Design a protein around this motif. Structure first.
Motif, PDB file in Angstrom:
ATOM      1  N   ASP A  45      -4.428   8.504   4.108  1.00 23.64           N
ATOM      2  CA  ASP A  45      -5.196   8.013   2.937  1.00 23.64           C
ATOM      3  C   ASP A  45      -4.565   6.774   2.653  1.00 23.64           C
ATOM      4  O   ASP A  45      -5.234   5.767   2.160  1.00 23.64           O
ATOM      5  CB  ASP A  45      -4.431   9.046   1.832  1.00 23.64           C
ATOM      6  N   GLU A  46      -3.171   6.557   2.910  1.00 22.23           N
ATOM      7  CA  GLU A  46      -2.529   4.995   2.875  1.00 22.23           C
ATOM      8  C   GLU A  46      -3.432   4.022   3.709  1.00 22.23           C
ATOM      9  O   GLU A  46      -3.718   2.964   3.293  1.00 22.23           O
ATOM     10  CB  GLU A  46      -1.179   5.031   3.062  1.00 22.23           C
ATOM     11  N   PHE A  47      -3.776   4.469   4.989  1.00 17.96           N
ATOM     12  CA  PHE A  47      -4.310   3.635   5.887  1.00 17.96           C
ATOM     13  C   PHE A  47      -5.741   3.353   5.440  1.00 17.96           C
ATOM     14  O   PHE A  47      -6.286   1.955   5.624  1.00 17.96           O
ATOM     15  CB  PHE A  47      -4.493   4.194   7.377  1.00 17.96           C
TER      16      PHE A  47
ATOM     17  N   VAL B 115       0.855  -0.992  -0.082  1.00 17.66           N
ATOM     18  CA  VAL B 115      -0.028  -0.017   0.020  1.00 17.66           C
ATOM     19  C   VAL B 115       0.988   1.291   0.119  1.00 17.66           C
ATOM     20  O   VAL B 115       0.563   2.248  -0.392  1.00 17.66           O
ATOM     21  CB  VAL B 115      -0.889  -0.067   1.244  1.00 17.66           C
ATOM     22  N   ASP B 116       2.129   1.204   0.582  1.00 17.05           N
ATOM     23  CA  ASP B 116       2.910   2.312   0.804  1.00 17.05           C
ATOM     24  C   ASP B 116       3.155   2.784  -0.828  1.00 17.05           C
ATOM     25  O   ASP B 116       4.252   2.427  -1.280  1.00 17.05           O
ATOM     26  CB  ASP B 116       4.069   2.197   1.402  1.00 17.05           C
ATOM     27  N   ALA B 117       2.385   3.605  -1.318  1.00 17.35           N
ATOM     28  CA  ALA B 117       2.511   4.047  -2.550  1.00 17.35           C
ATOM     29  C   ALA B 117       3.866   4.795  -2.900  1.00 17.35           C
ATOM     30  O   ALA B 117       4.327   4.697  -3.811  1.00 17.35           O
ATOM     31  CB  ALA B 117       1.294   5.016  -3.026  1.00 17.35           C
ATOM     32  N   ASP B 118       4.194   5.520  -1.846  1.00 17.46           N
ATOM     33  CA  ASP B 118       5.467   6.322  -1.729  1.00 17.46           C
ATOM     34  C   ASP B 118       6.523   5.522  -1.237  1.00 17.46           C
ATOM     35  O   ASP B 118       7.735   5.894  -1.480  1.00 17.46           O
ATOM     36  CB  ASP B 118       5.312   7.624  -1.180  1.00 17.46           C
ATOM     37  N   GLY B 119       6.215   4.434  -0.528  1.00 15.67           N
ATOM     38  CA  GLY B 119       7.133   3.436   0.275  1.00 15.67           C
ATOM     39  C   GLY B 119       8.162   4.721   0.947  1.00 15.67           C
ATOM     40  O   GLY B 119       9.248   4.979   0.612  1.00 15.67           O
ATOM     41  N   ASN B 120       7.771   4.932   2.301  1.00 18.86           N
ATOM     42  CA  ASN B 120       8.493   6.079   3.157  1.00 18.86           C
ATOM     43  C   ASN B 120       8.748   5.130   4.362  1.00 18.86           C
ATOM     44  O   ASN B 120       9.960   5.718   5.021  1.00 18.86           O
ATOM     45  CB  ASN B 120       7.813   7.392   3.103  1.00 18.86           C
ATOM     46  N   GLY B 121       8.191   4.283   4.661  1.00 21.64           N
ATOM     47  CA  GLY B 121       8.412   3.235   5.719  1.00 21.64           C
ATOM     48  C   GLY B 121       7.254   3.750   6.885  1.00 21.64           C
ATOM     49  O   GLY B 121       7.206   3.358   7.957  1.00 21.64           O
ATOM     50  N   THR B 122       6.194   4.732   6.437  1.00 21.79           N
ATOM     51  CA  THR B 122       5.354   4.883   7.653  1.00 21.79           C
ATOM     52  C   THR B 122       3.766   4.720   6.457  1.00 21.79           C
ATOM     53  O   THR B 122       3.809   4.704   5.562  1.00 21.79           O
ATOM     54  CB  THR B 122       5.352   6.426   7.707  1.00 21.79           C
ATOM     55  N   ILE B 123       2.616   5.048   7.486  1.00 18.82           N
ATOM     56  CA  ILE B 123       1.449   4.864   6.811  1.00 18.82           C
ATOM     57  C   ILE B 123       0.589   5.934   7.232  1.00 18.82           C
ATOM     58  O   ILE B 123       0.315   6.315   8.333  1.00 18.82           O
ATOM     59  CB  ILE B 123       0.707   3.567   7.351  1.00 18.82           C
TER      60      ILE B 123
END
Ligand SMILES: [Ca+2]
Ligand SMILES: [Ca+2]
Length: 79
Positions: free
Chosen positions: A66-68, A55-63
């Motif tokens: 919108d992602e959640f 789901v991490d569309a951006d892949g930052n290591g956080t949620i």
């Protein structure tokens, strides 16, 4: 109906805020692990990464919200 009346958002936002026990606005992998850990489940970083990445569309290591919301709605899109 789906304007000022924010029922679905509140639920999602409520679940997200609760997860973000810190209230920083974002849940880190470690913080997520704490939430998942409570849910009687505790996958390894790998699963957490693959799940978060999924789901991490951006892949930052956080949620984020919108992602959640997507992750929840994505697994419950059935409704
Ligand atoms: Ca947090
Ligand atoms: Ca992210």
């Amino acid at each position: 109906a789906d304007i000022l009346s924010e029922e679905q958002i509140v639920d999602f936002k409520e679940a997200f805020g609760l997860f973000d026990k810190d209230g920083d606005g974002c849940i880190t992998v470690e913080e997520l692990a704490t939430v998942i850990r409570s849910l009687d489940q505790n996958p390894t970083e790998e699963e957490l990464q693959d799940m978060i990445s999924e789901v991490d569309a951006d892949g930052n290591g956080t949620i984020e919200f919108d992602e959640f919301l997507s992750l929840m709605a994505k697994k419950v899109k059935d409704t």
